[PDB]
Design a binder for this molecule. Structure first.
Ligand code: BEF
Ligand code: BEF
Ligand code: MG
Ligand code: MG
Lengths: 121, 121
């Protein structure tokens, strides 16, 4: 299963890709809004793991991009972000995120939530 | 959409059913393990909102019951529980929960997660 990992802090992104590799996934990297848009293409990701605060546009705006395009609107998105306030968790979910995980995170819970979401398609 | 609400603290259960009613759902109540098993029938619930610590058996065991039976294994389950330790969140998800929410909760986030899960079927 391919996972688009969207995260601008390169050492965190690489750590996340390692956890995912070790858990059976094939991650692909995007470091900002525009890279995520461009990287979002064939071969399609099975899921998009998405930071909120990114150069060039937020992950909220990215979900709006995904959901506006009939070709991408069914691709699951799980947010993984330092924005932990209730208002933000609700905002992410309501925009279209299938789940929303806050930093710092447990690598076991991260993988468990991704696989839970993947079970639901 | 029908929601089976499994929770043994009756005033919390009733509060939860109120939030769900106000948000477009048709909740049905179960106060313990055996009631949840019995209440789990036609007309099927669209989703099961499930407390962990219940008389007669845990919500973990209930998910095992659901997943063993081909007639019920695709019904989404969201846990809502005072068991907040990382180990428990992972345990719930790995058993088959589509999401896992800890008490005390935001009624906006509760509804947002239920609808996110409902979007994924
Ligand atoms: F920049 Be992310 F929201 F942690
Ligand atoms: F009894 Be529940 F797990 F809050
Ligand atoms: Mg960031
Ligand atoms: Mg209980």
């Amino acid at each position: 299963r391919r996972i688009l990992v969207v995260e601008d802090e390169a050492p965190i992104r690489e750590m996340v890709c390692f956890v995912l590799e070790q858990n059976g996934f094939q991650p692909v990297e995007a470091e900002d809004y525009d890279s995520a848009v461009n990287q979002l293409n064939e071969p399609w990701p099975d899921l998009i793991l998405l930071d909120w605060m990114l150069p060039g546009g937020s992950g909220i705006q990215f979900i709006k991009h995904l959901k506006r395009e009939s070709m991408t609107r069914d691709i699951p998105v799980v947010m993984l972000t330092a924005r932990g306030e209730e208002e933000d968790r609700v905002r992410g979910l309501e925009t279209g995120a299938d789940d929303y995980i806050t930093k710092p995170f447990s690598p076991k819970e991260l993988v468990a939530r991704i696989k839970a979401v993947m079970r639901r398609i």
